[PDB]
Every structure is written in C-alpha cells, then in structure tokens.
C-alpha cells in the first residue's frame, strides 16, 4: 500500500519515502539511510512536535500519505 511521506531537515531539504502505514519508525529510518547515508542511530524523527519511538508504526501516530516528518540530527 505504498503511500508517500516527506522528511525535511533544518537545511530546507525534502526527502521522499515510499512507505506503508504498517512499517515501523525503525523501517523509515532505514529508508532515510538508503537515501542519505545517515545511520539509524544517527537520527530522530518528529511529527507535529511529538518524538516518534522506534517500535511504533506510522498508523500508531496517525501518519498518512503526504505527511511531513522532521529529521532531528541533534539529541534533545
């Protein structure tokens, strides 16, 4: 059920992922690694100000097609 989400960084860059609502946040970090070379342990993901945890899914956060997550590259 390939939908499309976006991942923006502090530099203004947008990244386009092909995902399903089933996949874990860990899975999308691995897709960020495939496009950006960033290891999963080197990144965090935020949705509407809420820190996403690795085991939970995109549906667990009501993340849907065309949503925009924010790549966080310092540790808060």
């Amino acid at each position: 059920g390939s939908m499309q989400i976006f991942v923006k960084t502090l530099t203004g860059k947008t990244i386009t992922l092909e995902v399903e609502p089933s996949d874990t946040i860990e899975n999308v970090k691995a897709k960020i690694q495939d496009k950006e070379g960033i290891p999963p342990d080197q990144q965090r993901l935020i949705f509407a100000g809420k820190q996403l945890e690795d085991g939970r899914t995109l549906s667990d956060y009501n993340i849907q097609k065309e949503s925009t997550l924010h790549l966080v590259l310092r540790l808060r």
């Binding site: 342990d41 080197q42 690795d54 540790l75």
Partner: protein, 149 residues
C-alpha cells in the same frame, strides 16, 4: 500481591550482594522505589559526602529503563535542577540485559568524572569548563553543606 519476578529476584541480589560504596534498599510502601545513598568517591570533590538518590522502576521495567533523581542537592554538571540524571545510552537502547547495578555504577563513575561538555543550558556546565579549578572547590563546599550527616 503481584510484582514481576525480575524485580523480586533482583532486589534480593541487590541487598545480598551490594556494590562497594553504595547503599540501596527498597521503600517499604512501594517496592519499585529505592532509597539510595552513594558515598562520594575517593579523591573526588565529593569525597566525604553521602548523597541520597530516589530510583523508581516504572510499570514497564525491565523493558523500560528506571528513572533516577538526586534528593540530596549537589553541585555537578550532569544533574538536573530537580536532581534528575541522564541514563541516555549512545547508539543503543535500554534492554532488559542491563540492570539497576549497572545504573548505580554509572552514576558512581559519573561523580568520579564529571562531563561538563553536554547540555550547556545550565550554569553548572559553564563553570565546569571555564574555571574548572574553581568548580572543584565549590563542589567541595556543597559537599560539606548538604552531604554531611
């Protein structure tokens, strides 16, 4: 009535085999809370002091890490305004393979070797790099004032 076997069996080995320099015992009302006292390590600014720590095991332990906080006010760059501690693991996650013992040991080494270079949002980190020689002594003063008797 019910409380996980891991907590029960770990609490047993914590009182039967405690770590050098640390006292840790369950609260008698809620056995998930722990009254901890750590003797300030030898040849450290906190030598001679005795610092009291509240360790709490959340419902999800040991799948989730415990939460730790200083009850005794202390001068140290890695301590919260409310006394809370990091416990953040670098490029890894808390798994039930790590124990309370490892938590207590890490806090014990954290006193023996403060790390100012971390969050600078509090002043204690600024003084712990600017004039480190003068941060050792004001920590010695807070040891006398709050960590004795």
């Amino acid at each position: 009535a019910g409380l996980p076997r891991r907590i029960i069996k770990e609490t047993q080995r914590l009182l039967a085999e405690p770590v050098p320099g640390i006292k840790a015992e369950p609260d008698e009302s809620n056995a998930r809370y722990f009254h901890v006292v750590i003797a300030g390590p030898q040849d450290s600014p906190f030598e001679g002091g005795t610092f009291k720590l509240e360790l709490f095991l959340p419902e999800e332990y040991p799948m989730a890490a415990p939460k730790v906080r200083f009850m005794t006010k202390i001068y140290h760059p890695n301590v919260d305004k409310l006394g809370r501690i990091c416990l953040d693991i670098l490029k890894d996650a808390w798994s039930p393979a790590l124990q309370i013992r490892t938590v207590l040991l890490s806090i014990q080494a954290l006193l023996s070797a403060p790390n100012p270079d971390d969050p600078l949002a509090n002043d204690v980190a600024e003084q712990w790099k600017t004039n480190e020689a003068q941060a050792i002594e004001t920590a010695r003063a807070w040891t006398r004032l709050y960590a004795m008797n």
